Amino acid sequence: VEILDNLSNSSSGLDFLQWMCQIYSSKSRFVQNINYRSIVPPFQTGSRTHTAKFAITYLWSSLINCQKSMLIDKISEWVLTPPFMEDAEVWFIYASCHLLKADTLSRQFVNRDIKINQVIKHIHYVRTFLKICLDKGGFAVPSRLIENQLKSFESRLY
Amino acid sequence: LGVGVQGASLYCPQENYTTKKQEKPQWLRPVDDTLAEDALDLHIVVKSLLCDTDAFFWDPTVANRLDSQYIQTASDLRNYRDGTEIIAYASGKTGSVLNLTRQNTLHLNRHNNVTSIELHSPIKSIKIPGASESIGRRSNLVGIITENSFQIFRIESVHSRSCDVMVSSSEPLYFVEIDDLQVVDFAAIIDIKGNWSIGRIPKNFNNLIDNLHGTIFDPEELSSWKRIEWFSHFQKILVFDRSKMIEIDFMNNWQTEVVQAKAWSNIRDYKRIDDKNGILLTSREIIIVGASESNDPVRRISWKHDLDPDDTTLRITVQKVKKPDHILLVAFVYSMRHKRIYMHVFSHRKANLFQSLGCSTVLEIPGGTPTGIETILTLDFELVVDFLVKLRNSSEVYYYALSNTVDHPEWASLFNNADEREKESIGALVSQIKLKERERISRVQNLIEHENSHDEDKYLQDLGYRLSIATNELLESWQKTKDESIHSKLKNLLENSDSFASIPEFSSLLDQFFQYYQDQDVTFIGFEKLLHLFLHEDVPGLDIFYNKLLQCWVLVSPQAELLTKEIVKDIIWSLARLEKPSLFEPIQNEISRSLSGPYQDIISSWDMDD
DNA sequence: TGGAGTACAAGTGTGAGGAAAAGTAGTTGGGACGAAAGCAGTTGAA
């Protein structure tokens, strides 16, 4: 919080969470037998079947940071690369990155054969990443309320 | 309904940028993080009194010694009256004597009469259950927990013409099984060390356990801290140790383990918030505001905050703040080892939209550590909030309000003898110095009477003459004794260095005495490169060394001068080590010791390498 | 106007504690370019 809420010559905290998720990337299994001294899982380590909290804070705070910069392609290219096949929160973020492109591009700037179908691609990415998010374990989304927003992107498109 | 949940758990932790967004594209801060947004919130104490009256471990079974909440008695039902505020605290010798209204700040009332009901057992917990708003009324009965029995008090028709609360009591049930019970709550429903039972309260004080009971007994939890609370009016109970929370509904036979807190944390405290949905839990390492669920009233594990302090003795108290748009839940954790509070601000809206704002900390009184802290309900953006503390190792209770906008008797019990014949016999010495000082303020005053006289120029010509030949007497022994092969005093003359009346002259005179010894067996240590150790700055001189103390001791002394003169006249004679020989004398004592040690300590003794 | 009991301190042996950076204790990661022809002695059964 100190780098982001300093704002003077700041890295805004996002290059430091990038530092955390580079050198503490460890897909190793949690051996669950040794007594643990000076480490604890739920806030500072990142084993297999547990995404690290600095990893998902790097995903939330770079989606929100990219929204406020209006580069979403570059986060959507990164989230593509790690298919965390053990959790639903990364897939909700990956579904929500495409919802933001499907939100931004659904203004149409007229009152176009390529402007149409690209939004349909992002709408179909949301409906298929939210489905695989909901098939996983516990991450309860307002899955009705998001469908009201995807249809609203298409009614503006028609 | 925000999005980032586990279902099982739900986090808004310590400044780690909470884990949700709806992406509400509504141009109205298009995000609904659990983190909220506002300005700051600084808190300011309003310190005021309300009332009054081996060590490497601490007892978990002792809980509190007081209570403070609005009570509505039996005669207020039929009549118009609604709600009277009381405070009942232990007193006495071993904590055994349990004993009101609000003008603008809560103060003890006019007739201010302690209703000292008497017991024969140590008080170890004093608490009400609280009230309900579904019942519409307030409870007028309170239960306390002691070592020897369990007691119930019943408050009947609090009086207004005399400010006197007559109290009634139930039968104090002693122990059939010899096991010290821990916690009461009602919403004799009690928790013994390892098992619980439901107790029945009667209507007739003019003269127990029901046929259903349960146990949570763990062979590998070691502590003696348990806790019980009724949950969400279903006659579900919640039972605690330091390792798990068990949910038990005695309506059916239905027992579920919900929290299992063995691995990295422990359950520390559990306050049931007057909100019949939301209830706040203090674990070690996290603060949990786990509410109730509308589908099944089991546990809505809500937005919890990762608290930082690690400790073994943390409590919590919570106060609701009811605004018309939303409900706040400020949570105050406090420890028995140090003097601090730690707070966090929660908010709640209609759609179970629990949020979080930030944290702050303030301090307490320096004498003791807090042991019981309770918020006054206050009958129910500039947040105001008020409460009472109680500190351990002091029997005083003070009252505090928070708005948005060191003496120890052990040093006293080391002096002050009761020996009246030895009183002035000690006290003569403080009157003995009444004589000895006034001579010294007057004799150097006779030197104040003279100012750079030739009669005292003679007196200092006589000074160095018995410093020259005395040196010439103290030199001529060391040359003949020089072959010792195995410094001095400069207080040999006891005739002078008492009545010399110039600092810049004697500084020059010793420099006049320094220049005289060009010969061997005599060196010195210079004062001006060393006199700075008292002022802790660059002091290159002896004459400006007085000039620092000259401006320094002006106010705090009668006439302020010759006392300041005499100490400067003392320190150069206090470092009276000016009797070093030449360089030859320690160098020839270097070479003698390495010869005496073996050839193994030759290579061990080498200074000046790199 | 000597003795009987007795707490305050000067003074003397027993082991028990304290710490660190070296090494070693169990899991998991990881190491190993070929589907050619007429023909002949033996050899099929007639």
Alpha-carbon gap: A141 to the closest alpha carbon of chain B (Å): 5
Compute the distance between CA of residue B353 and CA of residue B356 in angstroms, rounded to an integer: 10
Q: Residue B358's closest chain A neighbor by CA?
A: A1
Kindly list the residues from chain A whose CB atom is less than 8 angstroms away from the CB atom of residue B18. 60
The answer to whether some atom of strand C lies closer than 7 Å to the beta carbon of A29 is yes
Q: Check A142 against B22: CB less than 8 A apart.
A: yes
Alpha-carbon gap: B17 to the closest alpha carbon of chain A (Å): 6
Handedness of CA A87, A88, A89, A90 (dihedral sign): positive
Nucleotide nearest to A48 (CA to C1'): C28
Alpha-carbon gap: B18 to the closest alpha carbon of chain A (Å): 8
The answer to whether some atom of strand C lies closer than 7 Å to the beta carbon of A32 is no
| Helix A72-80 / helix A89-104 crossing angle, nearest 10 deg | 150
Handedness of CA B426, B430, B435, B440 (dihedral sign): positive
The answer to whether some atom of strand C lies closer than 7 Å to the beta carbon of A49 is no
**Residue B190 burial by Cβ neighbours in a 10 Å radius (0-12, 13-18, 19+):** buried
DSSP B568: H
Interface-testing mutation among A62, A68, A92, with chain B (most B C-beta atoms within 10 A): A92
Which among B265, B273, B263, B290 is positioned nearest to B7, based on CA atoms?
B290
Encoded amino acid at B462, one letter: D
Q: Residue B30's closest chain A neighbor by CA?
A: A67
Compute the distance between CA of residue B43 and CA of residue B385 in angstroms, rounded to an integer: 9
Q: Check B5 against A139: CB less than 8 A apart.
A: yes
> By three-state DSSP, how is residue B461 classified?
helix
Alpha-carbon gap: B271 to the closest alpha carbon of chain A (Å): 25
Instruction: Mark the nucleotides of strand C covered by protein, meaning any atom under 7 Å from a CB.
Output: 26-29
Experimentally, the structure was elucidated by cryo-EM
Partner B contacted by A96 (CB < 8 A): yes
Q: Are B124 and B139 in contact (CB under 8 A)?
A: no
Which residue's entry shows tokens 């709550």? B185
Compute the distance between CA of residue B191 and CA of residue B265 in angstroms, rounded to an integer: 22
Q: Check A140 against B5: CB less than 8 A apart.
A: yes
Which residue's entry shows tokens 């030895």? B422
CA B443 to centroid of chain Cα atoms: 52
Compute the distance between CA of residue B173 and CA of residue B152 in angstroms, rounded to an integer: 10
Give the helix/strand (H/E) hosting A62.
Answer: helix A53-67
Q: Check A142 against B8: CB less than 8 A apart.
A: no
Give A53's contacts (C-beta < 8 A, 6+ positions apart): A42, A43, A44, B13, B16
Q: Are B238 and B249 in contact (CB under 8 A)?
A: no
Partner B contacted by A99 (CB < 8 A): yes
CA A63 to centroid of chain Cα atoms: 6
Kindly list the residues from chain B whose CB atom is less than 8 angstroms away from the CB atom of residue A60. 17-21
Nucleotide nearest to A47 (CA to C1'): C28
Which among B166, B49, B73 is positioned nearest to B111, based on CA atoms?
B166
Compute the distance between CA of residue A36 and CA of residue B330 in angstroms, rounded to an integer: 34
- Contacts A–B by Cβ distance under 8 A: 61
The answer to whether some atom of strand C lies closer than 7 Å to the beta carbon of A28 is yes
